[PDB]
Write a protein that binds this ligand. Structure first.
Ligand SMILES: Nc1ncnc2c1ncn2[C@@H]1O[C@H](COP(=O)(O)OP(=O)(O)O)[C@@H](O)[C@H]1O
Ligand SMILES: Nc1ncnc2c1ncn2[C@@H]1O[C@H](COP(=O)(O)OP(=O)(O)O)[C@@H](O)[C@H]1O
Ligand SMILES: Nc1ncnc2c1ncn2[C@@H]1O[C@H](COP(=O)(O)OP(=O)(O)O)[C@@H](O)[C@H]1O
Ligand SMILES: Nc1ncnc2c1ncn2[C@@H]1O[C@H](COP(=O)(O)OP(=O)(O)O)[C@@H](O)[C@H]1O
Ligand SMILES: Nc1ncnc2c1ncn2[C@@H]1O[C@H](COP(=O)(O)OP(=O)(O)O)[C@@H](O)[C@H]1O
Ligand SMILES: Nc1ncnc2c1ncn2[C@@H]1O[C@H](COP(=O)(O)OP(=O)(O)O)[C@@H](O)[C@H]1O
Ligand SMILES: [Mg+2]
Ligand SMILES: [Mg+2]
Ligand SMILES: [Mg+2]
Ligand SMILES: [Mg+2]
Ligand SMILES: [Mg+2]
Ligand SMILES: [Mg+2]
Ligand SMILES: [Mg+2]
Ligand SMILES: [Mg+2]
Ligand SMILES: [Mg+2]
Ligand SMILES: [Mg+2]
Ligand SMILES: [Mg+2]
Ligand SMILES: [Mg+2]
Ligand SMILES: [Mg+2]
Ligand SMILES: [Mg+2]
Ligand SMILES: [Mg+2]
Ligand SMILES: [Mg+2]
Ligand SMILES: [Mg+2]
Ligand SMILES: [Mg+2]
Ligand SMILES: [Mg+2]
Ligand SMILES: [Mg+2]
Ligand SMILES: [Mg+2]
Ligand SMILES: [Mg+2]
Ligand SMILES: [Mg+2]
Ligand SMILES: [Mg+2]
Lengths: 293, 293, 293, 293, 293, 293
C-alpha cells in the first residue's frame, strides 16, 4: 500500500527526471507545467490545453479538414500575441489570407511579417532563421501539406528547428490539412460538427477540437465552440456555458442571470450581454480560469 | 500400450521441467496453468484464453486491421483491472484515445497514467521503468507500429522488459495494427467479420478473435462477440449464447427462458433482461466459467 | 553383355551394401524399400512416393510458396496417423493453425500434442525429446523458416535428431516456405498451378507436387490434385482419373462408368458417386495401389 | 629453315612422347586424337570439340550461370549414349531433374541409374565404384557446387577416380554452377547470350559455349546455338547455318535451297524442313562433319 | 676530380666485366645493351624499356591485377614476333584465351603452339624442352599463379630454364596476377589507372606500366597508354602524344598538325588520321624512336 | 671526490684510447666526434644524431615497418649529398623506386648509379667494389631483407666492406624492413605513429625515429616529423617547432611571430611562411643547429 505508493512516486519521478515532467502524467491530475502561453481565443480550448493557451518555445500542429477553423484559430493566436506586443510571422504556402477577416479577429496586419516561400526547404530555412534571431515570438506555417520539395517542383531540419525555437522561446504552429507527429508538444484535431443558424440562414459552424497530444499538461481533453462567419470564435458564448457550469452564472430555464440579475433570455442574449459588458465578462472569465486551471 | 503411455508422460514431463508447463500441451486438455488473470471484458475470449483472462507478469500482443476492436479490448482490460484497484498505464503513440468512450467502458480516466513518447526507444524505456517499479499492474502500448526509431525520426530491450515484467507481475499488452512474436505469452488475432444492425442502421460490428499463441493454456481457440458503437463488447449477448450452449438457458424457438421463466423473445430481448438483472446474470456467468474453465 | 550385366549388378549391390538400398536406383524400377508409411491423403502423391506414403523413422521436407498446400498435406498426414491410433505432435512457429479446418480434414485436435517454442534451438530440442521418447509417431514442424536462433531473438542438432527419429521409428516433417536438404529422406516441392472454379467462383486450387528427393523409392515422380477450400485434398477426384488410367473405370466421352454402370456425367459427378459409395471406392483404390505400387 | 623445322618437329614429338599427344598442339591443326566420343546434341559444339563429341574415359567439366543450359547439355549427352545402348548414371545433389523434359530430349528415364548422395565424399565414392565396375559408360554429376563435405554437414579422390574412369573407358561429366580444373580433359564455359522470341514471346535462349580446355584436340573453339524451352538444343537450326557456311545449302537472301530446291523462306522454315526430312538432314550433317572434323 | 672520374670509370668497368654490362648503370644514361628485341605493341613501353622492346633469350615477368592488360600485352608481343616469322608458344594454366580478340590484335592463331599442362612441374618441363629445341622464339606462360604443384593437386628448374633460353635466344614471358624476381631480366608492373569513355560509355582503360626491373637498360621508366576493348593498345594515340612531345607534330590548342597541315581537331581525330595514313605514321614513329632510343 | 673524478676521467680516457672516442660516453654530453656528415633532410633527426647528419665512411642501418619512411629518408640523404656534388649509388633488391617522387625530393636521378643484383653475394661484392673505388660517396642498399643467398635462389663480407668504406670515406646505408647490428655505427628505428590530415583527408604520416645505436655521439635521442605524400619530410614544420623551443620564434597562442612580426596563424601557416622565405629560414635553421649541436 503505502510502500507501493512511494515506489510509484519514485518511479514516476525518475521517468520525469530522465525524460521531462510531461513524459508521463495521470490524465486526471490538475497540475500543469509552468510554461508561458498565448491564448487561442477560445476559452474552452485554453482550458482543454491545461496551461491556458499554447506553449511558447514549442512546436504545435493543428490539423483538420478544409473549413474546420484552423486558420481562424492561428489568426486569433497571432492577435493575442500582438496585443501583448509580440512579433509574429506568417509563412504562407496556401496564398489565401484575408486581411479584412484577420483585422476583424484583432490581427495587426501592418506589423505581421509574411513570407511566401518557393519550396518546402526554403520555408523551413526561413522558419529556422526567424527562430535563431531570438526576435520572433510566434511563427505560423500554413500549410504543411502545401510545402512541396524543391526536387519535386523542378526530419533533420525539424530537429534543428525544434532546438532553435526552444532556445529563443519561439512558438511555432504548423497548420496541416512522423517528424511533426513526434516533435510537436501539442497536436490539435479540429473539425466542424454542425452549422450555426440565426433562424433559417447559416451564420457559422459548431466546432470541436480534441487535444490529441499534449506534453505540457494532460492530453485528450476536448473543447467545443462556435465560429461565426466574419467574426471568428464565439468567445462570449463559451463564457456563458462555462460560467453556468462553474455555477457563476445561473440559468432559470431560459433566463440567465448573474449575481441576482438577468443578463438575457436564451444563450444568444446572455452572450450579447457579456460582450457589451466586458469589464464584468473579464471577471467571470478570470474566475473560470482560476477554477479550471 | 501402458508402457508407451508412461514413456510419453515422462517425456512430456521432462520437456515441461526443462522449458515450462506451457512448453507443450494436448490441444484438448482441460487444464490451465495457475496464473493470475484480468478479464478482457469478453466472456467467450476469457474462455478461449483457457485461464479466464490475460495473464499477469506476461507480454501479450493483440493485432488486427484498423477498427477491428483492439483499443476497445485493451480499454476493457484496463477497466477490469482498475475495478480491482490495480494501477494502469497507457503508452500512446497513436494520439487517438477518446476518454468519453473509455469512461463508458468503465475506465477510471482520472487515475490512468499516460505517456506520449517521442521515440520508440523512449517508449520501451518508460515501459521498463514502470515494470521495474513493482507498482504498476497493467501497461498498454498503442501501438507497436507507431513506435518510430529515434535515428529514423532525426530485441535486447524486449528481453530485459520481459524479465522485469515477470519479476513485478506486470501485464503488458502491445497493440499492433520476431521479438514480440517470440516473447509474447499470448497473441490475439482480431478482426471484424460483419456489421450489427438494429433494423436498417449499423450499430456495431461482429468480431472474431483467434488465440494464435497461448503459453498458459491450449492455443487456437476462438471467440466471437459484438462490439457496439459507444458501448463496447456486448457481454450479455455472449452470456445468452453461452448460457444456452451449456444448457443453463433454454431456447424455445425464439423465446429464451431461465429456470422456467421467459427472459425475452429474440436474443436482443434476452440480452436486455440479463443486463437489467445483473445479480442473476452473475450467477449464470459464474456457472458458465466453472463449466468451461 | 551377360558379363557386363553381372558386373553392373555386383557393383550396384556393393554400393547398396555400403550405403543402403536407396543409395542408387534405376528411375524406372518398380521396386521400393520395405518401409512402414503413413498416407499423405493424396492418392497420386502416395503413388509418386513409390512406397504408398511417407516413411516412418525418417525426416521429410515439404516446401513451396505460401498457400500451396503444405499445411493441408501435413494435417492430412496427421489425420491418417491418428486414425491408426498413432500419437502426433505439432511444433508451431507460425501461429496459424485453424482447428475447424483441421477437424474437417479428419484431425483429432483434442489429442494432438502442440508446442509453440520461443527459439529455434528450443524447438529442435523438443523434437529430439519427443523423438527419444519412443512414444511419438509423427512430428510436424511448421515452419523451418520461422525458427529464429536464440542469439538473434536477443547441423549438429540435425544429426542427433535423425538418429533418434530412426531408433524410435518416428516420422518428422519439416514445412519450409544444407542440413535438411541432406538429412531428409524425402523432399517435396509443392506449388499451386491453377484455380478450381465451380462455375464463376474459385473454390480451390490445382496443385502439383514433385518428389525431388526420395531415398526409399525412385525419385522425380509427380502428383497432381485439387485442394478444395474448407475440404482439403480432392481424393475422389484423383481416384476417378487414376481409375480411368488403369482401365478400371470407363469414360465414354463425358460419361464415366464402372463395371457396366454409369457413375456420373462429368468428372465432378463421377467424383461425387465414389465419395457417396466409399465401400466400392475403397475397392477401386485398393486395385489402383496394387497396380501402381 | 628446314633444320629448324626438323628440330621443332622432334621437340614437339619428345614432348608428346613424354606427356601425351594432347600435351602440346598448334591451335590451327586439323588433327585430333583418335578417341571414342558421345555427341553433345549440338552440331557446332561437337565441331568445336574437334573430336566430334565428348571423349570417353575422361573427366569433363561444364560450368556456367544458372539457366545457361548445363543440365540440358548433359541430358542430351545421356540420350545420345543410351541410343547407342550405353549405360548411364546421374549423381544428383541438386534435386531438380524433370523427367518429362528429359524424355522430350530423348533420355530413357526408366533405365537411367540415379543416386542422391548424403555427402560429397559419398558421391565421389559412388562415382568411383561405378567407374571401377567397367559396366557404366557415362556418369553425370550435378552439381559440384552442391557436394557438401560430410564434416560440414555435421584431390586424392580425384586422382583415383580419373584412373578408374580411364581404365574402364567411362565418361564422367561434372556440372559446376584446382583438382577438377587440372584433372579434366575438357572444360566448357557455357552462357546465355540472348533470348529467342517467336514474335513477342520468349521461347528460348541464345547460347554460347567456349571450349576453354581441350586435351584431345585444339582448345578455344566456340559454339553458338539456341536452346528452346521444352525442346532442348535447336540442332536443325545449327545445321542450316553450318550447311550454308560449308556451301552445301544456298541462301538467296531470305530463301534457303538445297540441290536446286527451296527448303524454306527464313531460317525458321529452313530449319523445319530439315527436321521433317531427317534422311536428307543426316546426309548434310554427315557432309558437314567430314569437312570440319 | 679527373682522377676521381677515371677511378669511377675503372670501378664501374670492373663491375661490368665481372657481372655484365647491365649489372650497374646511371639511371640517366642514354645507352642500352645491344640486344635483339620484340615490340610490346606500345610505343611508350618500347621506349621505357630502353632497348625498344623485350629482349630475346631472357626471362620477363609482367604482373598486375586482373584486367590490367597483361594478356593483351603478351598477345601483341606474339603478334609482333609472328609478323617477323617467329615461332611462338602459349603455355596456359588460365584457360581463358579468346582467339577472336587475339586475331584482332594480329595474332596468327592457327600457327600458335599451345599447351595446357596438368601441373606446374609439367609446364616448366615443357618450357625447357621448347627452350632447348632452338626452334621456338617466344614462349608466354599465363599464368605463374595458376601453376599448381603436382603434390598439391594430388628454383632449380628456373636456373636450367634460364640457361637454355639464353643458349637458344628464346624470349620467355611469365604473366603473374624470389626465383622469378631474381632470374628475370625485365619485370613490368602494369595497372589500370582510369577508364576511357567515348562520351558516356566506357570503351577502354587508361593504363600505366612501370619497368621495375631492367637489366638491359636503365630501370624505373614508365609508360602510359590506353587499351581499347576489342582493339588492344591504342598505339596511334601514343604516337600523337610522343610526336608532339618531340616536336614532330604541332598542337595549336586543340588542332594537331604535321608539316604545316592539320591532321585532326582533338587527340581522337589526330589519332584516327595517323591510323589511316600508316606510311606517314611509320615515318613519325621511326623519328620518335631514333630520338628516344 | 676530486681523486675519484680524476680516476674516472683517466679510465674513460684509456677506454677511448683502446676502443675509440665513441666506445663510451655520458648520455648527456654535448660533445660529438669530429666527423663529416650528410643531412637526413630532417632537422630533428640531424639533431638527434648529434653530429648533424649521417657519418661518412661508416655503415648505417635504418629499419622499420613498410611505409614508415625508410626509402624517403635515404632518398633525401642522396639528394643532400648530390647537391654537394657527391656521387651516389642505389643497390636495389626491392624493385620499387619511383623517380618522379625521387626528383620531387631533390634527387638527381640522371646521375644516380643503380644496380639490381641477382643475389645477396653479388650485391655485397658490388658495394665493396664501389667502396674500394674511392670515387663513390654514398651507397644505399634497399633492402637487406630482400638480399637472397645465391644457394637459396638456385659476416666475413661485412668486415671487409666496413674496412673499405672507412678507407674511402664512403657512407653506406642498409635499409631493413648480428653482423649489421654490430658493424653499424648508427642504427635508426623508424615508425609511423599517426596520420596527417588536411581537414578530412589523409595527406601524410606522423613519424618517429629513435637513434637506437650511435657510435659518433650520444645514442637514444629521438626525432619526430611529418612525411607528406609526394613531398617528403616536412622540414619547415620541424623548423617552426624547434624555432619556438629555442625561443627564436614566439608563439602567442595560435599566432607565430619572428622578430616582432607575425609569420602565420597556426603551425601550417607559419610553416608556409618559412618555406616561402628560405633566406630567413636558413638563418633560423643555422641558429637552431648552433644551439643544439
Ligand atoms: N475570409 C473570411 N471571411 C469570413 N469568415 C471567414 C473567412 N475565413 C474563414 N471564415 C470563417 O471561419 C470558418 C472556418 O474557416 P477557416 O479558419 O479558414 O478554416 P480552415 O483554415 O480550417 O480551412 C468558416 O466556415 C467561416 O465561418
Ligand atoms: N470513440 C469511440 N466512440 C464510439 N465507439 C467507438 C469509439 N472507438 C471505438 N468504438 C467502437 O469500437 C469499434 C472498434 O474500434 P477500436 O477498438 O477503436 O478499433 P481498433 O483499435 O482495432 O482500430 C468501432 O467499430 C466502434 O463501434
Ligand atoms: N483455414 C482454412 N479454411 C479453409 N480452407 C483452408 C484453410 N487453410 C487452408 N485452406 C485451403 O488450402 C489451400 C492451401 O492452404 P495451406 O495448406 O494452408 O497452404 P500453405 O501451408 O502451403 O501456405 C488454400 O488455398 C485453401 O483452399
Ligand atoms: N524442365 C524444363 N522444361 C522446359 N524447358 C526446360 C526445362 N529445364 C530447362 N529447360 C530449358 O533449358 C534452358 C536452360 O536450362 P538448364 O539446362 O536447366 O540450365 P542450367 O542447368 O545451366 O541451369 C532453359 O532456359 C529452358 O529453355
Ligand atoms: N576477349 C576480349 N575481348 C575484348 N576486349 C578484351 C578481351 N580481353 C581483354 N580485353 C581488353 O583488354 C583489357 C585488359 O584485359 P587483359 O589483357 O585480359 O587483362 P589481364 O590479362 O591483365 O587480366 C580489358 O579491360 C579489355 O578492354
Ligand atoms: N612514390 C611515392 N609517391 C608519393 N609519396 C610517396 C611515395 N613513396 C613514398 N611516399 C610517402 O612516404 C611515406 C613513407 O614511404 P616510404 O619512404 O616509401 O616507406 P618505406 O620505404 O619505409 O616503406 C608514404 O606513406 C608516403 O606519404
Ligand atoms: Mg530531460
Ligand atoms: Mg508529469
Ligand atoms: Mg485556412
Ligand atoms: Mg518567385
Ligand atoms: Mg515533445
Ligand atoms: Mg524453466
Ligand atoms: Mg503442459
Ligand atoms: Mg485503436
Ligand atoms: Mg513465452
Ligand atoms: Mg549402411
Ligand atoms: Mg537401390
Ligand atoms: Mg501453412
Ligand atoms: Mg537419407
Ligand atoms: Mg604418357
Ligand atoms: Mg599434339
Ligand atoms: Mg541444371
Ligand atoms: Mg588431362
Ligand atoms: Mg659475366
Ligand atoms: Mg652498365
Ligand atoms: Mg589475362
Ligand atoms: Mg638477370
Ligand atoms: Mg682504436
Ligand atoms: Mg667518448
Ligand atoms: Mg621503401
Amino acid at each position: 500500500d503505502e510502500n507501493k505508493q512511494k515506489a510509484l512516486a519514485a518511479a514516476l519521478g525518475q521517468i520525469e527526471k530522465q525524460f521531462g515532467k510531461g513524459s508521463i502524467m495521470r490524465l486526471g491530475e490538475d497540475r500543469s507545467m509552468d510554461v508561458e502561453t498565448i491564448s487561442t481565443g477560445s476559452l474552452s480550448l485554453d482550458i482543454a490545453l491545461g496551461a491556458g493557451g499554447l506553449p511558447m518555445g514549442r512546436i504545435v500542429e493543428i490539423y483538420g479538414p478544409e473549413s474546420s477553423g484552423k486558420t481562424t484559430l492561428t489568426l486569433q493566436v497571432i492577435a493575442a500575441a500582438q496585443r501583448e506586443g509580440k512579433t509574429c510571422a506568417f509563412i504562407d504556402a496556401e496564398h489565401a489570407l484575408d486581411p479584412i477577416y484577420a483585422r476583424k479577429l484583432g490581427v495587426d496586419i501592418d506589423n505581421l511579417l509574411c513570407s511566401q516561400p518557393d519550396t518546402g526547404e526554403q520555408a523551413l530555412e526561413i522558419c529556422d532563421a526567424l527562430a535563431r534571431s531570438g526576435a520572433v515570438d510566434v511563427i505560423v506555417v500554413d500549410s504543411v501539406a502545401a510545402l512541396t520539395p524543391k526536387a519535386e517542383i523542378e526530419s533533420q531540419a525539424m530537429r534543428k528547428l525544434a532546438g532553435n525555437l526552444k532556445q529563443s522561446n519561439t512558438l511555432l504552429i504548423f497548420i496541416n490539412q512522423n517528424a511533426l507527429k513526434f516533435y510537436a508538444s501539442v497536436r490539435l484535431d479540429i473539425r466542424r460538427i454542425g452549422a450555426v443558424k440565426e433562424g433559417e440562414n447559416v451564420v457559422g459552424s459548431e466546432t470541436r477540437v480534441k487535444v490529441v497530444k499534449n506534453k505540457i499538461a494532460a492530453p485528450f481533453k476536448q473543447a467545443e465552440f462556435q465560429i461565426l462567419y466574419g467574426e471568428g470564435i464565439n468567445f462570449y458564448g463559451e463564457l456563458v456555458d462555462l460560467g453556468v457550469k462553474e455555477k457563476l452564472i445561473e440559468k432559470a430555464g431560459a433566463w440567465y442571470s448573474y449575481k441576482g440579475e438577468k443578463i438575457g433570455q436564451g444563450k444568444a442574449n446572455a452572450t450579447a450581454w457579456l460582450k457589451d459588458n466586458p469589464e464584468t465578462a473579464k471577471e467571470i472569465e478570470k474566475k473560470v480560469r482560476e477554477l479550471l486551471l
